[PDB]
Design a protein around this ligand. Sequence first.
Ligand SMILES: CC(C)(C)c1cccc(-c2cc(-c3ccc(C(=O)O)cc3)nn2-c2ccc(S(C)(=O)=O)cc2)c1
Length: 235
Amino acid sequence: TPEVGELIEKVRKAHQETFPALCQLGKYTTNNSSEQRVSLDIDLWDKFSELSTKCIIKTVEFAKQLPGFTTLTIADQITLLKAACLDILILRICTRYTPEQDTMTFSDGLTLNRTQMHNAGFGPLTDLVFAFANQLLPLEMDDAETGLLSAICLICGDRQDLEQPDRVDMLQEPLLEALKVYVRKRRPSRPHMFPKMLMKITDLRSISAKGAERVITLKMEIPGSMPPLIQEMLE
Ligand SMILES: CC(C)(C)c1cccc(-c2cc(-c3ccc(C(=O)O)cc3)nn2-c2ccc(S(C)(=O)=O)cc2)c1
């Protein structure tokens, strides 16, 4: 379909322009607590929170390129971004997972193993985030699919305090339709692929809810090392 093809192309381009892929980056490592579990490696947390600020900027750039996002009220654009920020950041870091080395790669090439991701701040959430990354791999998702899943996660009408939830639901409707027809065309062998992918958003919300609780825990324990929160940055 030309209207569907055009929508897929726009979302694939919005994602590619705001997300450097694992293959494109020059991986580098750090010796910082690489083989020792610690409650919090402040040097790892410092690098990690600086990378997060840059990634939140890219997410906002991605959101603004989604057809119709900027037509929503400013209050609703802020509400959607605050609610999906952790979900999108989780999806982005899990997209750069290397299973044999059990590492994830940041947008500047920084490559941390499971112990280091735990020490950088993930703590009790590490195994859940790494399990999600492991579940993504067999889906063999391309840029169009990752972009569309990110857009579906963002443009969600069930978020608390939305001024126009039906409008947001209507904006989400062509994205779901595009992903359905796209996965059908590209993978006709597996017709269960589309609901398997939407199930990942359900998994993402659960992990994101736990993540928000960890943000609060970290704000309590290390307030002086906390960068401005997601809510603070987007406002
Ligand atoms: C457990 C917990 C640690 C809370 C957590 C939970 C879920 C997601 C994150 C998270 C992922 C990224 C990220 C950074 C860079 C890239 C890139 O380079 O591709 C990709 C992703 N950042 N990030 C994050 C969020 C808030 C904050 S905070 C408290 O607001 O300081 C700091 C960091 C973190």
